[PDB]
Amino acid sequence: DGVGNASGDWHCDSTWMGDRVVTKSTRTWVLPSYNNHQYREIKSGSVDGSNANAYFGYSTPWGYFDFNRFHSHWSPRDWQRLINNYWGFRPRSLRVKIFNIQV
């Protein structure tokens, strides 16, 4: 759209609705330009006296979003509300949004 209009809003919440609970988290991220835009082939030999440490691979100039920790979605208090009252739980869906970008 445009420069002077915001592309999304801030949502942090927890909505308990019986058999479901929906968590929302918003964070502010910063992204460095990695490697100076190029792929590099990274590698290692036997480090610390262990060749299980050896590897061969590639670093890229990309970064990624990782939300695979519970504390990224649950507050200490909602976590307590979950473990003191339920016998189990499992994830059902996921929705992600990236907005308000600034280079």
Next chain:
Amino acid sequence: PAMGGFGLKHPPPMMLIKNTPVPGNITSFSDVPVSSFITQYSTGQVTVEMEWELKKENSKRWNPEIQYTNNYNDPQFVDFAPDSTGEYRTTRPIGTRYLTRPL
């Protein structure tokens, strides 16, 4: 009420019960009321069913709250359970305020 609880204009009515008297062997007439009865007692079951309305806790506290919890250091017996004799034990008064709210 000073002792706690709900103060009611019209509270749950009193339920009274008694064993209807049964006269012993009476052989002659008298205007004087009968005073010899067959001794007896009764027994039965009583069921009370109460519906309560709840006010859902709606906090935004971040950190975890205080909760009533079964915490005993080196229990010799289970509290709120019958002991070896069969008599019910209770070692602590359980109030009602664990959750918090900002004024």
